[model samples]
Target: KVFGRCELAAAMKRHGLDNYRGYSLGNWVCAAKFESNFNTQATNRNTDGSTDYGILQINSRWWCNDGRTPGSRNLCNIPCSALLSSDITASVNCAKKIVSDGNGMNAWVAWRNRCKGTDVQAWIRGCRL
Candidate 1:
């Protein structure tokens, strides 16, 4: 489902994302569309058969479960529900910490690049920060 500008804006605002402009949000929408078809519940298996889950394809096992005892879900690890539950700002903030402490746009840009196609990368780069 391709998100319109207003919907994207609401999503960004709901998440407390302020550094990104409308065009940047649009670009992020594009990237998300290409990556997971905007499916918040998306998940994938890596070459080693480990799992990456949720909108950002966070590796649940690596971040959420590795070295921990069973039944202890790391909310601070993947934090997928936080993003899915319209707390995207919190999700992005958490992601920022994982990628580079408190560096929001830089982390998002890096993630976008990691999942980007050639055209998508161009579009993402063109968006105003």
Candidate 2:
């Protein structure tokens, strides 16, 4: 499922993504936009024989076990398929794990390049979070 900007804001907030760690909810929302356009089914194959899954595009190389990526850590201890569900509970928890691991939102290139060092207030501006 593809989500609109505010729709994503509400969803992420409902899943405990609000100001997770040091990153704001808007930061998460902004990152999702650039990463996968808020697409729950989004998947991207990387040049390193890894894949990114779900809205936040959690990587199969380290976070989720896709069974295809060599040397996967599966730090989130979740199957990559769960990240693609529209329910998004798995994806939200995994994203929390990513931040709590000290990687922060900078784990996502989209966050560093687009949402980092910017006022992301606009990303959730009118959202009923």
Candidate 3:
């Protein structure tokens, strides 16, 4: 199976990731670990009965709710079933856009600052994505 950095860097490059832009393999691992234990197929139920889907834990309601437009289907369009689909790179890229807006690793940097040394990993468990 594909391991960490190799897989992550490949994904980043496939998604056109550039300049650390606050994001990193570590941060992505941390966030994914916190969000879904890195289970690409993970999904969660909201208080309103809506669902957060995929490795990125994207909430479909945020983009696919009633009367929503397809253009709004960035990361939100990623379905739970499609979580592990071969198009995973696209999903990850979509998430990068949502998180970094093309800024790349800088997003990881910001996330590290926000979550570093905190109990975020504990809050989600020690998965490390």
Candidate 4:
């Protein structure tokens, strides 16, 4: 699924991501916009050989198991393929764990490069959520 800006924000907010770890839903929306452009099936292979999957682009190195990433911790305990589904529950859950794992939103390079130190509230402006 390729969600719209407001649609993605509402979905994340419904899943309790609005203020998770003090990061707003807009921040998440902004990160996803830059990371995957709201495409649920997005995937990217890193130079280090680890792969990132789904809207949040959760990585195979520590968050998911893809059977290809070497030395994967698979902390989310889910197959990386699960993150590619239109149902974003698994991806969002993994994102929650990523943020809660002492890195906050910095776990995602897109967030750091695009959303960090920026007011991302415009990402969700006028969203009915």
Candidate 1 per-residue lDDT over residues 8-127, each given as its tens digit:
445754564433432244445554555455555565665654555444545544344433334445545644444453334544455444444344333344345643344433433433
Model 2, residue 97: what's the lDDT? Answer: 86
* lDDT for position 6 in model 2: 91
Residues 40-127, candidate 4: write the lDDT tens digits: 9999999989999999999999989999988878999999999999988999998999999898999889899989989899899988
Candidate 2: the clashing residue pairs are: none
Among these predictions, the greatest lDDT belongs to 4
Evaluate model 1: give its lDDT.
Answer: 0.47
Indicate which candidate wins on TM-score: 4
Kindly indicate the candidate among 1 and 2 with the higher TM-score.
Answer: 2
lDDT of 3 by residue, 8-80 (tens): 4455445654234544445555555556555666667666655665655655555333233333343445444
Candidate 3's TM-score: 0.55
Q: How would you encode candidate 2's per-residue C-alpha lDDT over 63-95 as one tens digit per residue?
A: 999999998789999999999998889999999
TM-score of each: 0.50, 0.96, 0.55, 0.97
What value does the lDDT take at residue 116 in candidate 1?
A: 38
Candidate 1 residues lying further than 4 Å off, grouped into runs, are 1-6, 20-23, 66-75, 78-93, 99-129
Q: lDDT for each of the candidates?
A: 0.47, 0.91, 0.50, 0.93
In candidate 4, which residue pairs get closer than 3 Å at backbone N, Cα or C atoms, i.e. clash? none
What is the C-alpha local distance difference test score of candidate 4? 0.93
lDDT (0-100) at residue 129 of candidate 3?
33
